[PDB]
Structure 1
Amino acid sequence: LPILQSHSALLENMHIEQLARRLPARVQGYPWRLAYSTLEHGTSLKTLYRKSASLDSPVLLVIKDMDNQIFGAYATHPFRFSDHYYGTGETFLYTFSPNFKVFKWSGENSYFINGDISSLELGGGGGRFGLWLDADLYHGRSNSCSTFNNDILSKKEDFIVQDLEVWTFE
């Protein structure tokens, strides 16, 4: 019943079980491949976009902060540099806090994913982001945004990435 992965490091089986119940029909019954990991490939946003640039299927983002909280997003499109917001309403944010919560689209706006040379972010609605990351994958921020109506995904609004992974279904 639990899914097949080609390796793993931030997720234990109880995280795999609870995520795999929620992923869309698009990606049910596919093995998970590790596209990027800070622990395998070194730590930078330019490396994350470089490893993602060949992809053409959805991705799961997993983050562990320095307070050990696990959170991230499921995103309908790979993380790429974009002039404007992109993605579709099957995108969601999630956290284990320590109980698993998932914040699917509110229907209010389509500000799902935005990538820049110096940051990656998800959500919108004023100055808010459900998840923002710096060029180093060192500082990030999470606050409630009206795209997802999310909680704070970390233990704090402002956080340090301990480590980060991007998985693709392929």
Structure 2
Amino acid sequence: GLVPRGSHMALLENMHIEQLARRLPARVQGYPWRLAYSTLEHGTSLKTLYRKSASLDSPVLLVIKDMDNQIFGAYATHPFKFSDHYYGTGETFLYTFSPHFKVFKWSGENSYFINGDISSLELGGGGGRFGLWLDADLYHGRSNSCSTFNNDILSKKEDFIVQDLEVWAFD
């Protein structure tokens, strides 16, 4: 029940982080998670997130801490990359620890799982709505309810600012 070595998300160990590990697919259950990208350690930009993810042979966990110290993110079946079309598959889900742990799994309504653009990263879709959105600097973020996951707003408000962001891998 510990965050990866070198992670700065140690606040999760007091939020019962095993709630998230239990929601991982049995595919990756039992595999230790490791820190693949950290904004504090490796710099903050969407480009660096893509570059740090290019060598991952594993699904990933996106862990975001906003300026209200609320922690949330996503489990992606595919490492985050630039593409000209949506990717990711049915095991992709969103999660939040605010105000308590909640998971938002695939609803089967659409397959708008992940969209990695040059200037934004994006999860969830349907009617032009985004479940989770991050700008090119991984600074301004947004979270709405989307049909892909039937999620709640992951943080206190729709808009948030990234205080710290990490990507964990299992390979």
- CA distance in 1 between counterparts of 2:42 and 2:5 reads 22
- Give the superposition deviation at 1:9: 4.1
- Give the superposition deviation at 1:16: 2.4
Helix, strand or coil for the counterpart of 2:126? coil
What CA RMSD, in Å, does the superposition of the two structures yield over aligned residues?
A: 2.1
Aligned 8 A contact 1:3 1:20 in 2 = no
Aligned 8 A contact 1:89 1:110 in 2 = yes
Q: 1:79 to 1:10 in 2, by over 3 A?
A: farther
Q: Which ranges in structure 2 are unaligned for 5 or more consecutive residues?
A: none
The percentage of counterpart residues that share the same residue type is 95
Aligned 8 A contact 1:105 1:148 in 2 = yes
The answer for the alignment partner of 2:136 in structure 1 is 135
The answer for the alignment partner of 1:160 in structure 2 is 161
With the length of structure 1 as denominator, give the TM-score of the two structures.
0.93
Helix, strand or coil for the counterpart of 1:10? helix
Aligned 8 A contact 2:64 2:72 in 1 = yes
- Give the superposition deviation at 1:99: 1.2
Aligned 8 A contact 2:93 2:106 in 1 = yes
Aligned 8 A contact 2:4 2:35 in 1 = no
Q: For 1:33-80, what per-residue CA distance to the aligned partner results, in whole angstroms no more than 9, with x for missing partners?
A: 111011111111111100001112100000001111110000100000
State the aligned residue count. 170
- CA distance in 2 between counterparts of 1:13 and 1:32 reads 18
Helix, strand or coil for the counterpart of 2:109? coil
- Give the superposition deviation at 1:5: 8.5
Aligned 8 A contact 1:76 1:91 in 2 = yes
With the length of structure 2 as denominator, give the TM-score of the two structures.
0.93
- CA distance in 2 between counterparts of 1:148 and 1:50 reads 27
- CA distance in 1 between counterparts of 2:32 and 2:92 reads 19
Helix, strand or coil for the counterpart of 2:4? coil
Aligned 8 A contact 1:2 1:20 in 2 = no
Q: For 1:146-166, what per-residue CA distance to the aligned partner results, in whole angstroms no more than 9, with x for missing partners?
A: 000100001110111111000
Helix, strand or coil for the counterpart of 1:15? coil
